[PDB]
Structures are given as C-alpha cells and as structure tokens.
Amino acid sequence: VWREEKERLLKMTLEERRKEYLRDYIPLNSILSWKEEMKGKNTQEKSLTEKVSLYRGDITLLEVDAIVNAANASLLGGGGVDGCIHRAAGPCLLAECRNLNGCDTGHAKITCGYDLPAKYVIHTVGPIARGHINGSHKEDLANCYKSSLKLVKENNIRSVAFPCISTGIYGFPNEPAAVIALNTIKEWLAKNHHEVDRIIFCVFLEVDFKIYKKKMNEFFS
Ligand SMILES: Nc1ncnc2c1ncn2[C@@H]1O[C@H](COP(=O)(O)OP(=O)(O)OC[C@H]2O[C@H](O)[C@H](O)[C@@H]2O)[C@@H](O)[C@H]1O
Ligand SMILES: [Mg+2]
C-alpha cells in the first residue's frame, strides 16, 4: 500500500498533486532567495546568495522537492518537527519508515512525502547534547547536513528545506548549530551549486530566525 501510493505520487505533476492536498501550501516561487530579500537595502580578502533562502514557518507547508526531518534513531516519529511531519504526511510515512530499520546519528534516509506537498522526506538523526557539545557533536551535526545533501544529489532533488536539526529537545545550542548548518551548506554549494535551485533554511522559532539572519551574508555574500 505505501509502495503503491509512492509509485502513484512520484508520477504526478504539481498540478495533479495540488488537487488532493489536504492542507494549504507554500509554492517555491513565493519564497525569496537571499539575493532578493536584501534588494531593499570590511574584511580580509563564491557568491551563493541565489542558491539559499531563509524562511520562517512550518516546514510541512513547503512545496519543494524534499523537506528534511530532525528524526530519531528509530525513524518512527516523535514530537517537534518529526511529529509535525508525520501528522502532515499521513500513516504511509510511518509505514515506509517501518521498512527502513532506523538511522544512525549523522546519517540520512529518504522516503516519499505522501500527503505532504514535499515530494520526499529526507530523515536525519542529529546528535544529542546533554549539557555540552565537546564530543563528536559538531561533526555529527555537520554529517546530518552532508548526508542529507548526498541524498539530494542522488535523487535529483533541486529544492530542499532544512529545519534547525538538534536545537530542540536534542539541546544543541542555537548559535553554534547555525554556524555548522551554514558552513556545511556553503562548502557543499561551492562544489555543487549547479545541482540545486534552492536550499531553504526553514527556521521555526524567532530566536533561530534572528541568528540565521545575522549570519547569511558572512557565509554566502
Ligand atoms: N513544523 C515545524 N517546522 C519547522 N521547524 C519546526 C517545526 N516544529 C518544530 N520545529 C523546529 O525544529 C527544530 C528541531 O527541534 P526538534 O523537533 O525538537 O528536533 P531535535 O533534533 O532537537 O530533536 C529530535 C527529537 O525530537 C523528536 O521527538 C524526534 O523524534 C527526536 O527524538 C526546532 O528549532 C524547532 O523549533
Ligand atoms: Mg544532479
């Protein structure tokens, strides 16, 4: 049943999919690149501002090729963004995840998005910070983004959105997590910028929005 639904959905156009959406959606063309958002506006010595967006809101509304889930090792769901993604995708998402046998910290696995306007969900498991991030934490978080981007490339995905992985109940401090997310995407884009149209940082909390906004230029402009 999940296999059948998956094969059916992946054959459909946006136009067809939009007729069965259970919720409202945000089209990719309504999301400004960083380059456009700054249009209304020294240091020692690639422009990548066309390739990235900072977006505040519910990731499950985004009509993009893939959204990324801040999952746990079981891949079976939970709270926070994981819970939101499972509710919005419907029970076929859990069914496909039950066929996957979990996921390691810093790895990623890809599934169909089912009821989501997103074509795919890329599930990744962030590191857990219980008071400090001086173990493998920083590299583990970077690995989440790298592993997700590997699947982006392998699955011909041209638009992808990331939530603030690990900064919820997994407790990673917000500023260092943002530095890692931005640096990882920057480094990947230097080599792969023709591979995608947009990478969207979907922040949820005002705190993360403020952090990301102060850092976008130092990374991409
Ligand atoms: N609808 C949403 N859209 C975008 N971002 C969201 C949304 N809802 C929450 N966030 C943000 O998503 C970000 C991440 O917060 P968290 O969801 O706790 O994920 P973690 O990686 O720290 O913890 C993983 C565990 O949580 C789950 O139970 C899993 O099953 C795992 O067991 C925060 O910035 C949220 O504000
Ligand atoms: Mg490609």
Side-chain angles (χ1 to χ4, degrees), residues 1-38 40 42 44 47-220:
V1 173
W2 71 258
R3 292 188 191 270
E4 295 186 323
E5 187 64 9
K6 178 172 187 182
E7 186 194 4
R8 182 180 82 79
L9 288 171
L10 291 177
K11 283 174 190 280
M12 299 171 62
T13 63
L14 240 33
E15 295 68 29
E16 304 170 52
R17 282 298 315 275
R18 287 170 179 178
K19 304 191 133 286
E20 312 172 349
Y21 287 168
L22 299 175
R23 294 165 85 218
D24 198 13
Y25 69 100
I26 305 289
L28 175 58
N29 61 23
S30 75
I31 301 178
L32 304 189
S33 75
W34 186 242
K35 189 179 61 64
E36 314 181 281
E37 188 171 343
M38 60 161 57
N42 77 36
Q44 300 131 311
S47 177
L48 297 171
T49 64
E50 45 174 324
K51 297 288 179 166
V52 297
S53 286
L54 177 57
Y55 177 86
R56 184 176 179 209
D58 184 356
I59 198 169
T60 66
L61 294 182
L62 303 179
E63 192 183 60
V64 290
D65 290 341
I67 64 171
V68 177
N69 184 13
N72 63 79
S74 80
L75 294 185
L76 304 177
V81 68
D82 193 9
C84 288
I85 286 169
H86 281 268
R87 282 189 300 276
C92 287
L93 183 60
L94 176 55
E96 183 173 0
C97 285
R98 278 175 171 151
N99 188 247
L100 284 183
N101 308 312
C103 182
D104 287 342
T105 302
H107 296 207
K109 311 243 168 155
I110 187 170
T111 61
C112 184
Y114 301 103
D115 297 340
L116 292 163
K119 195 179 196 85
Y120 297 101
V121 175
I122 292 169
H123 310 251
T124 189
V125 179
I128 296 168
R130 288 181 184 88
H132 72 87
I133 52 170
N134 309 319
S136 293
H137 305 75
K138 295 189 171 187
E139 285 78 15
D140 283 345
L141 182 61
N143 288 342
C144 290
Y145 289 92
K146 292 176 192 181
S147 292
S148 293
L149 289 166
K150 175 163 159 187
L151 287 175
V152 164
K153 210 166 82 86
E154 277 163 13
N155 288 276
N156 311 111
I157 287 163
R158 292 196 59 82
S159 52
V160 57
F162 288 94
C164 297
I165 298 163
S166 286
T167 66
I169 65 174
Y170 281 2
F172 209 111
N174 306 71
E175 196 268 2
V179 170
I180 288 163
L182 296 168
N183 192 76
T184 304
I185 273 51
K186 185 187 70 78
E187 292 191 4
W188 187 87
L189 280 172
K191 306 279 129 114
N192 302 282
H193 70 276
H194 296 294
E195 293 261 15
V196 297
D197 296 315
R198 200 77 59 77
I199 295 175
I200 302 163
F201 299 100
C202 187
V203 299
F204 196 66
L205 301 182
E206 183 154 26
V207 58
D208 296 303
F209 182 58
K210 289 180 178 230
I211 290 168
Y212 273 76
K213 185 189 186 71
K214 299 190 190 187
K215 294 188 178 300
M216 298 285 290
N217 284 323
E218 93 180 65
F219 282 95
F220 304 117

PDB file of all heavy atoms in Angstrom, residues 152-158 194-196, ligand 2:
ATOM      1  N   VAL A 152      20.152  14.423  -1.627  1.00  0.00           N
ATOM      2  CA  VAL A 152      19.626  15.466  -2.505  1.00  0.00           C
ATOM      3  C   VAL A 152      20.193  15.263  -3.908  1.00  0.00           C
ATOM      4  O   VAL A 152      19.456  15.236  -4.896  1.00  0.00           O
ATOM      5  CB  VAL A 152      19.981  16.876  -1.984  1.00  0.00           C
ATOM      6  CG1 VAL A 152      19.780  17.914  -3.066  1.00  0.00           C
ATOM      7  CG2 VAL A 152      19.137  17.216  -0.747  1.00  0.00           C
ATOM      8  N   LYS A 153      21.506  15.074  -3.965  1.00  0.00           N
ATOM      9  CA  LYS A 153      22.199  14.888  -5.234  1.00  0.00           C
ATOM     10  C   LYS A 153      21.805  13.568  -5.893  1.00  0.00           C
ATOM     11  O   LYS A 153      21.534  13.516  -7.097  1.00  0.00           O
ATOM     12  CB  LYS A 153      23.716  14.949  -5.006  1.00  0.00           C
ATOM     13  CG  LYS A 153      24.503  15.486  -6.196  1.00  0.00           C
ATOM     14  CD  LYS A 153      25.933  15.850  -5.812  1.00  0.00           C
ATOM     15  CE  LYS A 153      26.841  14.639  -5.799  1.00  0.00           C
ATOM     16  NZ  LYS A 153      27.387  14.359  -7.161  1.00  0.00           N
ATOM     17  N   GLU A 154      21.752  12.501  -5.105  1.00  0.00           N
ATOM     18  CA  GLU A 154      21.473  11.180  -5.660  1.00  0.00           C
ATOM     19  C   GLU A 154      20.060  11.058  -6.205  1.00  0.00           C
ATOM     20  O   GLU A 154      19.800  10.260  -7.110  1.00  0.00           O
ATOM     21  CB  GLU A 154      21.703  10.109  -4.606  1.00  0.00           C
ATOM     22  CG  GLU A 154      23.139   9.686  -4.478  1.00  0.00           C
ATOM     23  CD  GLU A 154      23.417   8.961  -3.181  1.00  0.00           C
ATOM     24  OE1 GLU A 154      22.451   8.563  -2.490  1.00  0.00           O
ATOM     25  OE2 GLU A 154      24.610   8.801  -2.850  1.00  0.00           O
ATOM     26  N   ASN A 155      19.144  11.841  -5.651  1.00  0.00           N
ATOM     27  CA  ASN A 155      17.736  11.710  -6.000  1.00  0.00           C
ATOM     28  C   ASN A 155      17.233  12.852  -6.875  1.00  0.00           C
ATOM     29  O   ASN A 155      16.025  13.048  -7.045  1.00  0.00           O
ATOM     30  CB  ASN A 155      16.901  11.536  -4.726  1.00  0.00           C
ATOM     31  CG  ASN A 155      17.101  10.172  -4.108  1.00  0.00           C
ATOM     32  OD1 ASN A 155      16.457   9.206  -4.505  1.00  0.00           O
ATOM     33  ND2 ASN A 155      18.030  10.074  -3.162  1.00  0.00           N
ATOM     34  N   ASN A 156      18.182  13.583  -7.455  1.00  0.00           N
ATOM     35  CA  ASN A 156      17.876  14.647  -8.404  1.00  0.00           C
ATOM     36  C   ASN A 156      16.920  15.692  -7.839  1.00  0.00           C
ATOM     37  O   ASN A 156      16.045  16.212  -8.530  1.00  0.00           O
ATOM     38  CB  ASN A 156      17.344  14.049  -9.710  1.00  0.00           C
ATOM     39  CG  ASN A 156      18.217  12.921 -10.216  1.00  0.00           C
ATOM     40  OD1 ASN A 156      17.814  11.757 -10.203  1.00  0.00           O
ATOM     41  ND2 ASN A 156      19.431  13.255 -10.640  1.00  0.00           N
ATOM     42  N   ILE A 157      17.095  15.978  -6.553  1.00  0.00           N
ATOM     43  CA  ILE A 157      16.284  16.956  -5.856  1.00  0.00           C
ATOM     44  C   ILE A 157      16.859  18.350  -6.075  1.00  0.00           C
ATOM     45  O   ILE A 157      18.051  18.564  -5.866  1.00  0.00           O
ATOM     46  CB  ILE A 157      16.264  16.590  -4.361  1.00  0.00           C
ATOM     47  CG1 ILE A 157      15.385  15.361  -4.151  1.00  0.00           C
ATOM     48  CG2 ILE A 157      15.831  17.769  -3.481  1.00  0.00           C
ATOM     49  CD1 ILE A 157      15.620  14.680  -2.827  1.00  0.00           C
ATOM     50  N   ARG A 158      16.020  19.295  -6.503  1.00  0.00           N
ATOM     51  CA  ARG A 158      16.515  20.632  -6.851  1.00  0.00           C
ATOM     52  C   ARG A 158      16.104  21.722  -5.864  1.00  0.00           C
ATOM     53  O   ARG A 158      16.572  22.861  -5.947  1.00  0.00           O
ATOM     54  CB  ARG A 158      16.107  21.017  -8.273  1.00  0.00           C
ATOM     55  CG  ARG A 158      16.792  20.182  -9.334  1.00  0.00           C
ATOM     56  CD  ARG A 158      16.684  20.831 -10.708  1.00  0.00           C
ATOM     57  NE  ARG A 158      17.283  22.162 -10.759  1.00  0.00           N
ATOM     58  CZ  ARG A 158      18.583  22.404 -10.926  1.00  0.00           C
ATOM     59  NH1 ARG A 158      19.448  21.402 -11.050  1.00  0.00           N
ATOM     60  NH2 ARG A 158      19.020  23.649 -10.971  1.00  0.00           N
ATOM     61  N   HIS A 194      25.392  24.116  -9.086  1.00  0.00           N
ATOM     62  CA  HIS A 194      24.562  23.824 -10.254  1.00  0.00           C
ATOM     63  C   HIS A 194      23.595  22.653 -10.036  1.00  0.00           C
ATOM     64  O   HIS A 194      22.702  22.425 -10.857  1.00  0.00           O
ATOM     65  CB  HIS A 194      25.430  23.551 -11.490  1.00  0.00           C
ATOM     66  CG  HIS A 194      26.249  24.724 -11.926  1.00  0.00           C
ATOM     67  ND1 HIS A 194      25.685  25.880 -12.422  1.00  0.00           N
ATOM     68  CD2 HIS A 194      27.588  24.915 -11.954  1.00  0.00           C
ATOM     69  CE1 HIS A 194      26.643  26.735 -12.731  1.00  0.00           C
ATOM     70  NE2 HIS A 194      27.807  26.174 -12.457  1.00  0.00           N
ATOM     71  N   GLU A 195      23.767  21.919  -8.934  1.00  0.00           N
ATOM     72  CA  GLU A 195      22.950  20.732  -8.674  1.00  0.00           C
ATOM     73  C   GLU A 195      21.572  21.056  -8.101  1.00  0.00           C
ATOM     74  O   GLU A 195      20.682  20.209  -8.123  1.00  0.00           O
ATOM     75  CB  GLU A 195      23.680  19.769  -7.742  1.00  0.00           C
ATOM     76  CG  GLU A 195      24.922  19.138  -8.355  1.00  0.00           C
ATOM     77  CD  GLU A 195      24.669  17.735  -8.891  1.00  0.00           C
ATOM     78  OE1 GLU A 195      23.488  17.358  -9.060  1.00  0.00           O
ATOM     79  OE2 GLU A 195      25.656  17.007  -9.137  1.00  0.00           O
ATOM     80  N   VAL A 196      21.400  22.272  -7.587  1.00  0.00           N
ATOM     81  CA  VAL A 196      20.132  22.667  -6.980  1.00  0.00           C
ATOM     82  C   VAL A 196      19.709  24.063  -7.408  1.00  0.00           C
ATOM     83  O   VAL A 196      20.538  24.875  -7.848  1.00  0.00           O
ATOM     84  CB  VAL A 196      20.209  22.646  -5.429  1.00  0.00           C
ATOM     85  CG1 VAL A 196      20.465  21.242  -4.904  1.00  0.00           C
ATOM     86  CG2 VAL A 196      21.285  23.608  -4.946  1.00  0.00           C
TER      87      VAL A 196
HETATM   88 MG    MG B   2      22.186  16.295 -10.166  1.00  0.00          MG
END
